[PDB]
Design a protein around this ligand. Structure first.
Ligand code: HEM
Ligand code: HEM
Lengths: 362, 361
């Protein structure tokens, strides 16, 4: 129920331990006024300082002038901060505005078309995004709602996604959660304490060639539908072959414990873990931080389930792209379909109370 | 950590309200009464396992490599999480299996109400399963596996996820707030008031339908909120709408949330004044609904609201009169009912040999 510090060299919500709930919103910008947008970024930062500490935005949720609408919408009154983090990112489309063209990072690469892609253009892209994570879904929703409210007339929500439960882990000392296929998801990830691996694989560095991004990261979001009818009639051996780990313990095939190291030669050549593993991709490593979702029925008598996949990396060209290219023959492809996509540059952290989101860009 | 599954009544009505909801309505595809009774028996056996935190059937793993696992496995390593599973029968069920003359008169069709905008695809249903738990994954795993067990005899018609309080961080003494920012539940039937339950919630034998004794009747309404419009309303407009202040939730003119309201100090069309039993001939409801947020719609607005669930001894003397009295509710400016269903919720599963629906079939 505690708070996660908001200030830092990096934004919270990446190496932070993975909270139970997600509310992710992508915003489109609707103002041409650079100064207006900078003022928005500063107002948003002030709101975020309150929200992550469990305080109401502005003058609060009541006790103001009767004839005026309250500053804070109020549905989080009395709740703890609940480990709320708020992480902002900038989409490639943003750099066509406010004369930012020359400032677009090289590592903010557009993704190529991948085989099997069925991307819904409505639930894709976006000028910027805010990832709200908390252990309380009301806390996460209240944050997105109030950021959207403050930005009325300068940004509009393009699409959003709620994740009802995590399918990732940055804390290998706690239980690994399971995705909706029933497998543990997050065993071999980067941990928030492996400072060296975060510097190597996650945080942009000055020498990478975009100085304002130093201390930030790059995010890939992929909305992935799961064919659960198909999966649920597959044999247990089939399910375990697809991944290369057994379902119960989550151990690599042939080994006894979840965290024993995989021996890749023992897995099928098209097993997911075998193809995604750093050793199969020249060392490419990702920080996965995704969440499961279900959005009702599919109108055909079935539950509609999926995984909202989020990966942070130092450079999209050396993280997500090579691994996803190596997944072209993945046995998992039979059971999933990518239906939404977006990339964002996640700027460095807000260094102190006089700093603000995006200060190093603007 | 767990809630007993067996009892005179089904759990999940008078038992403590859990943090999360997964509500599913199903349509029946088989015409074979025997096949359906077999399914109800299999479902009950699975519900016994699920509510105790165990996998269904032979388990999620460790069986024949060439067989699909009995349980889909995404709840392995989780606790029971106070999971309750409550099943109900819709009016349309009674057109099958020769049951037409066993439909309770208290399971009334709802009239059309002013301002209804009901999505047919998210309304109705032959039966429902209300899955409540503190962990949303436990709830979803339950619905997912019951649907799989029933495949070929039932399909999912519509599904709704919801959330209330988060108990790890919030005291249970504390009234949760709905997404309009107001405390919600102050004057409600509590699970501890056994005589109020008997008077207002549980069906009695003399009520006219013996197989329903110890059951109850459920109304579900998916109520969208116009969030962005609400949020532009002055603080005084918001408080006038309900008849309670926003910070403390006290009735107008009083000091404490639990002060009994003075109805004449509220505006004539204030929500509490129109919903209160004194304005409806004593009609009193057990509310057990959940907030929802499904995402944002095509115009960028927040798809959010209250998945309203009311239990009552008779729909004709519970939900209908009160909802009727809300025709002029000042709240109507900010909400819209977009889904609706009613169900007969049968009595409880008495012991290890009983099953869901035994008194009806
Ligand atoms: C529904 C989609 C997916 C599911 C269900 C899934 C599931 C899994 C599972 C069960 C594991 C083994 C446990 C672990 O170490 O985390 C795993 C590992 C991994 N997955 Fe996926 N995955 C999905 C999509 C992806 C995608 C799209 C990528 C990258 C483009 C990816 C990259 C990885 C990586 C890098 C590992 C770690 C392998 C290692 O280093 O040992 N996964 N995934
Ligand atoms: C989004 C829709 C609705 C919202 C936000 C809402 C909210 C509230 C609030 C804030 C209260 C005062 C606190 C409390 O006693 O719980 C209340 C009371 C109540 N509401 Fe609603 N309500 C909604 C719809 C309905 C409907 C559809 C019904 C019945 C058909 C209903 C029946 C009642 C009743 C019976 C009370 C208790 C009044 C009393 O005895 O003091 N509500 N509601």
């Amino acid at each position: 129920g505690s708070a996660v510090p908001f200030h830092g060299a990096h934004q919270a919500g990446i190496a932070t331990p993975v909270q139970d709930r997600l509310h992710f919103a992508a915003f489109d910008v609707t103002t041409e006024d650079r100064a207006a947008f900078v003022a928005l970024l500063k107002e948003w930062t002030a709101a975020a300082r309150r929200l992550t500490a469990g305080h109401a935005v502005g003058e609060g949720a009541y006790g103001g002038l009767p004839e005026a609408p309250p500053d804070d919408t109020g549905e989080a009154l009395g709740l703890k901060p609940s480990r709320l983090t708020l992480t902002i990112g900038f989409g490639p489309s943003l750099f066509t505005r406010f004369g930012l063209a020359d400032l677009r990072p090289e590592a903010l690469a557009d993704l190529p078309k991948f085989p099997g892609d069925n991307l819904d253009r409505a639930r894709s892209g976006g000028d910027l995004c805010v990832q709200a994570c908390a252990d309380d879904p009301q806390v996460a929703v209240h944050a997105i709602r109030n950021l959207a409210r403050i930005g009325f007339g300068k940004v509009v929500v393009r699409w959003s996604q709620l994740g009802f439960g995590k399918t990732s882990s940055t804390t290998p000392d706690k239980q690994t959660p399971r995705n909706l296929l029933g497998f543990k998801d997050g065993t071999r990830n980067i941990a928030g304490t492996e400072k060296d691996r975060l510097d190597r694989f996650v945080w942009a560095a000055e020498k990478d060639g975009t100085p304002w991004m130093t201390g930030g990261s790059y995010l890939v979001a992929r909305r992935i539908r799961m064919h659960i009818e198909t999966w649920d009639r597959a044999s247990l051996q089939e399910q375990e072959d697809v991944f290369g780990r057994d379902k119960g313990e989550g151990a690599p095939v042939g080994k006894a414990k979840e965290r024993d190291e995989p021996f890749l030669k023992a897995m099928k050549p098209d097993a997911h873990v075998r193809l995604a593993h750093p050793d199969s991709n020249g060392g490419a490593t990702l920080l996965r931080r995704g969440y499961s979702f279900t959005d009702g029925t599919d109108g055909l008598g079935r539950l509609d389930a999926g995984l909202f996949f989020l990966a942070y990396q130092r450079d999209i060209r050396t993280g997500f792209v090579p691994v996803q290219r190596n997944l072209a023959t993945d046995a998992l492809n039979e059971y999933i379909q990518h239906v939404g996509s977006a990339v964002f540059a996640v700027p460095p952290g807000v260094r102190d109370a006089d700093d603000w989101w995006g200060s190093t860009l603007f």
